[PDB]
Amino acid sequence: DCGLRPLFEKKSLEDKTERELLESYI
Amino acid sequence: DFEEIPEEYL
Amino acid sequence: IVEGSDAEIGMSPWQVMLFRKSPQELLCGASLISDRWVLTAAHCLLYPPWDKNFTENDLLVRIGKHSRTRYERNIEKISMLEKIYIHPRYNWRENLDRDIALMKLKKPVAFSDYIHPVCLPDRETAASLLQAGYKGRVTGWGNLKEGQPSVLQVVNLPIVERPVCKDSTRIRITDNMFCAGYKPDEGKRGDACEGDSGGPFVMKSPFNNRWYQMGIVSWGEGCDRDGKYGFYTHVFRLKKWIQKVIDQFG
Ligand SMILES: *[C@@](O)(C(=O)NC1CCCCC1)[C@H](CCCCN)NC(=O)[C@@H]1CCN2CC[C@@](N)(Cc3ccccc3)C(=O)N12
Ligand code: NA
Ligand code: NA
Prior knowledge:
- The structure holds 3 protein chains of 3 kinds.
- Chain A is an all-alpha fold.
- Chain A has 1 helix and no strands.
- Chain A has a single domain, classed as Thrombin light chain domain (Epsilon-Thrombin, Chain L, Irregular), CATH 4.10.140.10.
- One sodium ion (NA) binds next to loops of chain C.
């Protein structure tokens, strides 16, 4: 169950800056 | 200023 | 952390606090990788130049924290160490090469909304993500400038090419390290700072949506100086050693 956060991914909610990481993986 | 911890931990 | 922001609650459930029994003080950052194992920077335990040599009895591991100093009753779990394992070839004498250690908890910890492990990279996850330009995330309760936050901070930084890394210092860089930070140019800032050591550098896989630990906060010359970068232990490169110990030692 590693790396899946109980308050974000498991509820399909995003943290306020995770998109900047994703948008960089070109 | 670290708030103290419960004795059972030391 | 310099120029970061307060983390949201439950944002880094694997963040651990290395804590000194007396004086009661924060020693370093760390990360939870399973219910009985913690990963940190070897120089957080052993560094002879500063007379540092911690033993299992000297410390405590505090998990599920948000505030740097209150005792978060009903949220945090405070554990004891059973054993400490330091990379047999860690170089404290010259450049902090192989700056990595494992700590095995006295009793397995229970997962909760605030407590959960991070994944460790596989060869192919490392190959697609560890690229110049991609961003990772660092967290910690360290100094705000080259002073102390009340809560965990966060910053996102880009990985930098090897050449740039080497031309920025006089220290000899090895394959066991990577450097991250913006260019003086890029006009965005941020870095790790004293007290952040032993914490995690993480990335979020675009393939399976999971968070992986790519690096450990190791060293830097100042905090957030222009033309300087932060250096991190290369977790994948040391993975064989990690396996080998979790295997052999419970
Ligand atoms: C860590 O946060 C750290 O280990 N903090 C300690 C616990 C709290 C009290 C102070 C010590 C730190 C983070 C640096 C971030 C900078 N942007 N790292 C270090 O202090 C490593 C440990 C050895 N030490 C020697 C001086 C260094 N600045 C530079 C250096 C010189 C020679 C070899 C390697 C690195 C350094 O960062 N540093
Ligand atoms: Na150089
Ligand atoms: Na810099």
